[PDB]
Amino acid sequence: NESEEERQFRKLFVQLAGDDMEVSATELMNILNKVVTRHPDLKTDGFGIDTCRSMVAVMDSDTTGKLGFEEFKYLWNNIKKWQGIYKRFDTDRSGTIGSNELPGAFEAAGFHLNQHIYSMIIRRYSDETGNMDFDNFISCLVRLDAMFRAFRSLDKNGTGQIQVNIQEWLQLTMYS
């Protein structure tokens, strides 16, 4: 009752974990470094482990270090959008987006901040060359996504503010 895609992966799931249906980082790293690392329709070595550990974290509410299939499915779906936005901005098919394209690709991605933040995010995900590989482009969007989702979860009413004690602050920022 779901995109033929998802139900295949699922195999990779049941093979690795059984009825648990969950996947470690490094395990999940593989699975992704396959759909997207084979294909020369897109240039990229593979997703970093770190990148990978983050995907898991922002989507683990049980603090077990495992990504559930349902959650996997949410992640993949934005992952395949953000696929869209990648290629659509890597003209040179360099395996990077040159600095000046990012902020488009980003606003593209649904997240709209200002210059002041992009002058930081860029300055923090790019290389010395100031360009962000795919790895980084995805990793970022994974974060941003989750810090945005975090705030919604902590502002259910409407105030455009959240208040966190210290435990909340470190759970929400250490597991990220």
Partner: protein, 625 residues
């Protein structure tokens, strides 16, 4: 998903969401809404999240393509009775029975319910019917490992040849019982899950109570007083013989020793020797009510406390005193009594309490009472306690483990665990006791005490040349310049700080606001780094190039930090690899973010309220930068 979700839920629970008065809407479905929706449309309800299909029947015994489920006709109460009723009051007996499918534990659980209103009602909203605002929907309220969850079902019940295949009264008229079993299957995933059930569990989930249970073969001494004491407090008891009909126990008076035995499928009870009891029956099950269950104005109730916890491989999963490397790592709790149980014969000095540890649903539990770890706890007489830590033992592999105690007033420490360490799980511990008892958590309070090293005049003259000759043309090093250098002092224990780490390093000590490290700042970094290698050095007792997860606690303390068990779980889950190892690069990276994350807070929180307030924009920046 993620942490921000558990936090929102946590806050919700602290506002009462999941208490009997505000139960959790299972799957987010609400009865009044969906009901009204169906009423505006003149349709009968069809639940999408548990339709009348194989799905809701089974996956193996009751699976699809399985012959036992071949040719089921789901039909609604109106289509098997001229006049369906939800519930009749007056109920002095029961005639529930089971269909050809469908476990027989439901008999006794449902039978207990039909002989206390205040009970039943707590799980079966009475305001419900086929004659009022009927729309083929009903709703129930189950207790779930500590909290209440309201489940909704459409009335279609399963049938073969117009015979109900599950729980259903023999008269054929009253539908509530069959419809409760449908919703309980529902929150367990399908009917077949109810197959191996235990009556104490489902009776636990029908009540919010705690089941205390005795193999008669080997009764304890003092049982009769336990029997008698339960009956005063108001507990449903249930007894039977092992292969098989369930009876309860309604009385327990001396004259001789004598307890009265009811049978709900009768209209009535009957006297018998306690000694004959012991001999005709083989199980006795007791189910103690929460104090808010009955409204009997003075029925004497239990006083209840409960808390919630976790085990996590790498940090908190220790358990069983058999494993003293780790036992102290489990989460700890403090129970402190005051009024001993009041006098009569006994023996003293007796504050009496029940300890229950139940294990919360794991993602592979397809059926009742399956894939249930071995769990257990210790109690001990009098910050997280260290390795230098009154019954313990009895580490069963049930969903709930329980022990009745009577111990002097004072303070005790409860440590729940699994039997072997290393198993992930959640749990709830409830304590019911005679008199007011107190509960408090015992763990390390959160604390960042980091030594404020510095910089002062001096600074290695070697230092100095070293960074200039390294900065190059600007007298500043980047996360990159920095990157490779460290890779040099490094390979020559480890294969370099990763590049992310480097970056956070720089984020911590920048301040120039420029992404680059001045001379002064690159000396702080360097001293902190050296500090991190020392600490890391000692923890690596084994001189393996690496640190096990289980050692972070300690590591972290030498580095000037103290956290609570849940933050500890978050560090090892985020900073360790399978196998519970944390490389030296991870380790510092962890400790750096943790220093930054505390700084930002105390600074946004200069008066120390204990909380900081952030707006999207400021959240996105701090939270990522």
């Amino acid at each position: 998903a993620g942490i921000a979700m558990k936090l929102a839920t946590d806050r919700e629970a602290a506002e009462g969401l999941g208490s009997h008065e505000r139960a959790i809407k299972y799957l987010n479905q609400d009865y009044e809404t969906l009901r009204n929706e169906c009423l505006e449309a003149g349709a009968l309800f069809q639940d999408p999240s548990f339709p009348a299909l194989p799905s809701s029947l089974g996956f193996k015994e009751l699976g699809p393509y399985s012959s036992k489920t071949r040719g089921i006709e789901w039909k609604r109460p109106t289509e098997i009775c001229a006049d369906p009723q939800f519930i009749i009051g007056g109920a002095t007996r029961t005639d529930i029975c089971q269909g050809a499918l469908g476990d027989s534990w439901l008999l006794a659980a449902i039978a207990s319910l039909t002989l206390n209103e205040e009970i039943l009602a707590r799980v079966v909203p009475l305001d419900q019917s086929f004659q009022e605002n009927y729309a083929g929907i009903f709703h129930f309220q189950f207790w779930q490992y500590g909290e209440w969850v309201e489940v909704v079902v459409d009335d279609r019940l399963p049938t073969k040849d117009g015979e109900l295949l599950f729980v259903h009264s023999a008269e054929g008229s009253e539908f509530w019982s069959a419809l409760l079993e449908k919703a309980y299957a529902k929150i367990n995933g399908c009917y077949e899950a109810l197959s191996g059930g235990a009556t104490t569990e489902g009776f636990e989930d029908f009540t919010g109570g705690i089941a205390e249970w005795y193999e008669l073969r080997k009764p304890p001494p003092n049982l009769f007083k336990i029997i008698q004491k339960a009956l005063e407090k108001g507990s449903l008891l249930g007894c039977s013989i092992d292969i098989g009909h369930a009876y309860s126990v309604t009385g327990a008076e001396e004259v001789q020793k004598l307890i009265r035995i009811r049978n709900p499928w009768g209209q009535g009870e009957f006297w018998m020797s306690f000694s004959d009891f012991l001999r005709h029956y083989s199980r006795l099950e007791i189910c103690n009510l929460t104090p808010d269950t009955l409204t009997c104005d003075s029925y004497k109730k239990w006083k209840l406390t409960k808390m919630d916890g976790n085990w996590r491989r790498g940090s908190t999963a220790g358990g069983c005193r058999n494993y003293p490397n780790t036992f102290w790592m489990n989460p700890q709790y403090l129970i402190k009594l005051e009024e001993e149980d009041e006098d009569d014969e006994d023996g003293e000095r007796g504050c009496t309490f029940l300890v229950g540890l139940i294990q919360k649903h794991r993602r592979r539990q397809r059926k009742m009472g399956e894939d249930m770890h071995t769990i257990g706890f210790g109690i001990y007489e009098v910050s997280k306690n260290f390795f230098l830590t009154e019954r313990s033992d009895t580490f069963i592999n049930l969903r709930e483990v329980l022990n009745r105690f009577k111990l002097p007033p004072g303070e005790y420490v409860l440590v729940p665990s699994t039997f072997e360490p290393h198993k992930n799980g959640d749990f709830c511990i409830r304590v019911f006791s005679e008199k007011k008892a107190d509960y408090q958590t015992v763990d390390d309070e959160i604390e960042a005490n980091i030594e404020e090293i510095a910089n002062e005049e001096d600074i290695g003259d070697g230092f100095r040349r070293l960074f200039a000759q390294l900065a190059g043309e600007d007298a500043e090093i980047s996360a990159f310049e920095l990157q490779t250098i460290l890779r040099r002092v490094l390979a020559k224990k480890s294969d370099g700080f990763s590049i992310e780490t480097c970056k956070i390093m720089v984020d911590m000590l920048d301040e120039d606001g420029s992404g680059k490290l001045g001379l002064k700042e690159f000396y702080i970094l360097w001293t902190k780094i050296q500090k991190y290698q020392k600490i890391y050095r000692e923890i690596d007792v084994d001189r393996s190039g690496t640190m096990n997860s289980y050692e972070m606690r300690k590591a972290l303390e030498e580095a000037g930090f103290k956290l609570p068990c849940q933050l500890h779980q978050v560090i090892v889950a985020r900073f360790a690899d399978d196998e519970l190892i944390i490389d030296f690069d991870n380790f510092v990276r962890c400790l750096v973010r943790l220093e930054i994350l505390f700084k930002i807070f105390k600074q946004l929180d200069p008066e120390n309220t204990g909380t900081i307030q952030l707006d999207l924009i400021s959240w996105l920046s701090f939270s990522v930068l």
